[PDB]
């Protein structure tokens, strides 16, 4: 594959790849695999609007052999009970989404704001020494994991552990990182799982006003199964922790490497919300999400066999030249949006929270500095699904 989704180049910068795929059409088979890249804006919107045809159950991911050949990493079949929340179809999906939304209501977000302000300040104090901070390990990796742990109700977490735990599932699900990294991720996910099961067993005996308690209560009344509830909580670390970490990393990487953009936001602090939205458009934390194709059908004109899969490429949709002027240019004056939080039945429940974490953290960084520059920029996580920088050493004044 001239158009492979893995390899050093695609990991570093996948956007030219998406434009090549788009030449073949808005939907296009990946090599000779059973996966079809969805790069068109209208095609992604159509797909997400057809949950009956394109299930969210994660029945397979795309992986690559050592020989570089795409192949399916098969998981739980269509309709299975392992599919929860973001990967569940209705009716279970709507129950799951309702329960989690209770912990993301307006009042909940206000509490989170106070929590985030205090946590961000402590992280900055600990991490910024002699005009230097490694942004990923000190801030971007930690803060969003602490927020997910607080939403769930975990007591006074070991932050070092949380980061490991929170990044484990992506690595395991793709099987793209090296074997030693995969073994460590498996240990990490075992540890995370076991910790959640321990905390849930304790919540069931005395439910408190957090998602653990909400779930313990809903299980007691028969609304869902105990194991389903525990798995739901496990998945929130990748869903809400890793994704937000990625945004915090990319936003800063852009500030640090585009002085013109950084001066614009400094000079006109009212452009911070636009800058966050443009980062979401231009470097979405998720490269994509899968769907399972239930029956032979068509999407935006393109044929799809039964039991194939879609890869919904949010980043590629956000650069569709039918929808956006100057799609490849980072601009602070746009007034269409983006599809980086999805749309429709599974539209991100955490979007307000994510946007709040970005606003708090980025305003702290900008308010406390006069100039930020990149001293050393690491590589990106080897992934087909997630767009996360691994290391970003800043020099500040
Ligand atoms: C920048 C940060 C974030 C991005 C880019 C992001 C993106 C997404 C996307 C694209 C979807 C739809 C997936 C699909 O259609 O298959 C989604 C769903 C979801 N997001 Fe996020 N998200 C972020 C932050 C968060 C946070 C902070 C939380 C929770 C604390 C969260 C929880 C979820 C959940 C539970 C769903 C599934 C909703 C449902 O199935 O009804 N997200 N998110």
Numbering used by the authors: 37 to 371, 374 to 435
Question: What text does the study give?
Answer:
The Mtb gene Rv1777 (CYP144A1) from the pathogenic strain H37Rv (which encodes the cytochrome P450 enzyme CYP144A1) is located in a region of the Mtb genome rich in genes encoding proteins of unknown function. In addition, the CYP144A1 deletion strain was markedly more susceptible to growth inhibition by azole drugs than the wild-type Mtb22. These data point to important function(s) for CYP144A1 in Mtb, and possibly to its participation in the Mtb stress response mechanisms.
The N-terminal truncated version construct of CYP144A1 (CYP144A1-TRV) was generated using the previously prepared full-length version CYP144A1-FLV/pET15b plasmid vector, and by deletion of the region encoding the first 30 amino acids. Consistent with this conclusion, it was found that the CYP144A1-TRV form crystallized readily, allowing the determination of a high resolution (1.55 Å) X-ray structure of the ligand-free CYP144A1-TRV enzyme. The CYP144A1-TRV crystal structure contains two monomers in the asymmetric unit. However, a dimeric solution state is unlikely, since solution state MALLS experiments indicated that both the FLV and TRV forms of CYP144A1 are soluble, monomeric proteins (as are the majority of bacterial P450s). Both monomers in the crystal asymmetric unit have a similar overall conformation, with an rmsd of 0.55 Å for 393 C alpha atoms. The structural elements (F/G-helices and BC-loop region) important in determining active site access and substrate specificity are those that are most distinct in CYP144-TRV from other P450 structures. This creates a large access channel to the heme cavity, approximately 10 Å deep from the protein surface and 10 Å wide. The active site of CYP144A1-TRV is predominantly hydrophobic, with Phe321 and His324 side chains located in close proximity of the heme 6th ligand. These residues are likely to be important in determining substrate selectivity.
